[PDB]
Amino acid sequence: PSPYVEFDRRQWRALRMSTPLALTEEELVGLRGLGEQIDLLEVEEVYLPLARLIHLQVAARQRLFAATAEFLGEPQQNPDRPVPFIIGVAGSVAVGKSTTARVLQALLARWDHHPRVDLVTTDGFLYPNAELQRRNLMHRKGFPESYNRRALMRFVTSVKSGSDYACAPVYSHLHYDIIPGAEQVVRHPDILILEGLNVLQTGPTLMVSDLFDFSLYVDARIEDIEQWYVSRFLAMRTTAFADPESHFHHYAAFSDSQAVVAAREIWRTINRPNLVENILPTRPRATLVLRKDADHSINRLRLRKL
Amino acid sequence: PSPYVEFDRRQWRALRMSTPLALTEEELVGLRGLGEQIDLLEVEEVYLPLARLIHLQVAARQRLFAATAEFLGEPQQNPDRPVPFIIGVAGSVAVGKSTTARVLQALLARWDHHPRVDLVTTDGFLYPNAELQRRNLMHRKGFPESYNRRALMRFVTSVKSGSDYACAPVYSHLHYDIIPGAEQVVRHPDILILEGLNVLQTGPTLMVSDLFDFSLYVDARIEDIEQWYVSRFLAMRTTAFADPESHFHHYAAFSDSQAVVAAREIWRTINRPNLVENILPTRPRATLVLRKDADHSINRLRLRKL
Numbered sequence: 001p002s003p004y005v006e007f008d009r010r011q012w013r014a015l016r017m018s019t020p021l022a023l024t025e026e027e028l029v030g031l032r033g034l035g036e037q038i039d040l041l042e043v044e045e046v047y048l049p050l051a052r053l054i055h056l057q058v059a060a061r062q063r064l065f066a067a068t069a070e071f072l073g074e075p076q077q078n079p080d081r082p083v084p085f086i087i088g089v090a091g092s093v094a095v096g097k098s099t100t101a102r103v104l105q106a107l108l109a110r111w112d113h114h115p116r117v118d119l120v121t122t123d124g125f126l127y128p129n130a131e132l133q134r135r136n137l138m139h140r141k142g143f144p145e146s147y148n149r150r151a152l153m154r155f156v157t158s159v160k161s162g163s164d165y166a167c168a169p170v171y172s173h174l175h176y177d178i179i180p181g182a183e184q185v186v187r188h189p190d191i192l193i194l195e196g197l198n199v200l201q202t203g204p205t206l207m208v209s210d211l212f213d214f215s216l217y218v219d220a221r222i223e224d225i226e227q228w229y230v231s232r233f234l235a236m237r238t239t240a241f242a243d244p245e246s247h248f249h250h251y252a253a254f255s256d257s258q259a260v261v262a263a264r265e266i267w268r269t270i271n272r273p274n275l276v277e278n279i280l281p282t283r284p285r286a287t288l289v290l291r292k293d294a295d296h297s298i299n300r301l302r303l304r305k306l
Numbered sequence: 307p308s309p310y311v312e313f314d315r316r317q318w319r320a321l322r323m324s325t326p327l328a329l330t331e332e333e334l335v336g337l338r339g340l341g342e343q344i345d346l347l348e349v350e351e352v353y354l355p356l357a358r359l360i361h362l363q364v365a366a367r368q369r370l371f372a373a374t375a376e377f378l379g380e381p382q383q384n385p386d387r388p389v390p391f392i393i394g395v396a397g398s399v400a401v402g403k404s405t406t407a408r409v410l411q412a413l414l415a416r417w418d419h420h421p422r423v424d425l426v427t428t429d430g431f432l433y434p435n436a437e438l439q440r441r442n443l444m445h446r447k448g449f450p451e452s453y454n455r456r457a458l459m460r461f462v463t464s465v466k467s468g469s470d471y472a473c474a475p476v477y478s479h480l481h482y483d484i485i486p487g488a489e490q491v492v493r494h495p496d497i498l499i500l501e502g503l504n505v506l507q508t509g510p511t512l513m514v515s516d517l518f519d520f521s522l523y524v525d526a527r528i529e530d531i532e533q534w535y536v537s538r539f540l541a542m543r544t545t546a547f548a549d550p551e552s553h554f555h556h557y558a559a560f561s562d563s564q565a566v567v568a569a570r571e572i573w574r575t576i577n578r579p580n581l582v583e584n585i586l587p588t589r590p591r592a593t594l595v596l597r598k599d600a601d602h603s604i605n606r607l608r609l610r611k612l
């Protein structure tokens with residue numbers, strides 16, 4: 001007896017799902033050009049249902065907002081509209097957080113209840129390399145203390161206060177640093193998706209996850225994430241690393257097998273240990289845990305018992 | 307702004323709430339039967355309205371349960387009813403948590419959506435004095451490490467899993483210790499209230515508050531709380547301390563002068579520090595913060611914007 005319902009992949013296909021509202025060819029196009037780490041079978045059989053499951057909660061938080069406002073005789077100090085519904089997305093580097101976020105954003109924005117869905121990466125809340133150097137934490141990029149937690153907290157709080165205007169800084173993966181001066185503006189969306197390694201981590205006081213209405217954790221076998229991590233690394237040689245402006249240009253010249261070495265080293269000494277100390281223990285805090293099998297398809301969902 | 311809708315006492319009284327919810331005289335017996343200090347006007351003017359708020363939340367959760375269950379063609383592994391709705395009640399020692407919890411228990415039960423409302427204090431999860439001693443922690447009773455946190459977590463998880471049956475141990479303030487083989491059974495209530503000064507405290511992993519659907523923080527000026535503390539202590543000379551078995555019998559003979567000295571020393575050195583370092587930091591993690599005046603009246607409410 002546990003606090004979630006479990007479905008393996010069989011049981012999930014095998015359910016009398018209520019709604020048609022299927023994917024028009026206008027949508028199924030935009031969808032190939034952000035996934036491809038995700039196939040449309042997955043979008044149809046897995047992510048769409050999820051999006052509706054989530055739609056149910058956003059819709060419920062919208063009705064309750066209103067039922068409450070009416071109950072109070074909609075007083076002056078109550079805001080005029082529900083505040084954004086914030087969804088957190090967590091998991092290891094290379095697990096697919098980013099795609100999953102992009103897909104959900106796309107699907108969730110299909111309903112008229114909540115057409116404005118924003119997306120923000122916690123990447124923009126890393127200290128700039130300048131500062132990471134100043135605090136002697138370069139070797140520590142991606143661990144809890146490498147982020148400006150205070151600013152991140154300030155940001156999410158600002159969003160849940162019903163600001164019409166909240167700013168987050170941008171991180172460039174190419175340049176391996178915060179793009180100075182660049183800012184993402186978020187103007188009271190209906191839903192904000194916040195993605196990052198750290199979104200379900202546990203501060204001493206208030207923490208960002210305290211302002212989440214729903215949170216999702218992307219899980220895989222640790223060997224499999226290594227495999228995905230390495231493949232992503234190799235691939236970056238010809239793309240990202242190829243650029244002369246890449247902090248990691250000197251990785252471009254690596255032969256396949258030499259790059260495989262380097263990758264498994266960066267994995268075994270930074271990314272795997274981070275996952276084990278800081279990310280994987282946050283798995284049981286998610287509303288929903290999705291497990292992906294060796295080749296990226298979901299083979300198990302855990303929804304928190306409603 | 308803040309993430310809070312804020313009302314003071316005036317504003318809160320002066321609201322048109324378009325259901326005239328009235329307490330029966332059948333209910334005004336029970337609510338005097340919970341004791342005194344208890345101001346019946348405040349039950350009518352504050353706690354009943356709040357009870358309606360919290361009700362709107364429980365009703366939303368029960369419907370959302372159902373719409374989700376429908377959506378999944380009600381599968382076998384989905385539970386049949388909603389799991390209990392959990393509400394945390396935190397705040398200092400002597401701030402009146404226990405009353406607030408007891409009144410709420412009584413008012414929430416009046417609706418037929420959730421007539422079964424259980425109340426459990428986390429004092430039952432303090433380590434027995436015996437164990438507090440093997441661990442050299444008697445001086446630290448009421449701080450985080452004096453609780454069997456693991457046990458507390460299993461308890462709460464069992465209730466949130468939807469189990470039919472869950473035990474908590476019972477603590478006696480009379481004997482100043484856990485009563486051996488005393489047990490409180492909780493049998494899938496519609497709502498469980500969990501009162502304790504630690505309920506909103508952070509764990510590094512999963513933590514109890516992760517299972518709350520709603521939570522309350524009873525607040526006051528720290529000087530005011532001391533004064534209440536000091537009376538509770540004095541008054542205890544007649545009641546608790548007066549029995550010759552009571553661990554604190556010697557305290558019955560302290561004159562108003564020596565009794566105050568003693569109370570302030572226990573405050574200044576145990577209860578006040580536990581509050582500054584462990585409880586007050588938890589205050590911004592509550593859905594609702596209730597602030598009290600010197601004279602025990604509620605003078606400010608902060609609800610988390612919906």
Ligand SMILES: C[C@H](NC(=O)c1c(F)cccc1F)c1nnc(SCCOc2ccc(F)cc2)n1C
Pocket residue numbers: 093094123126141142197228229230232233236266270271
């Ligand atoms: C430790 C470090 N940090 C990050 O790049 C990082 C991240 F990948 C994600 C979020 C925050 C971060 F600081 C790192 N991880 N891998 C590398 S080298 C390869 C470049 O980045 C990749 C990122 C994801 C991959 F799957 C493969 C490579 N570095 C320099």
Ligand SMILES: C[C@H](NC(=O)c1c(F)cccc1F)c1nnc(SCCOc2ccc(F)cc2)n1C
Pocket residue numbers: 399400429432447448534535538539542572576577
């Ligand atoms: C810190 C400590 N702990 C507790 O007894 C206690 C509690 F009162 C409540 C919950 C958990 C606890 F460990 C304590 N605080 N005051 C005392 S001695 C005086 C008798 O207890 C009182 C309890 C509550 C009061 F408001 C005033 C006095 N002790 C032993």
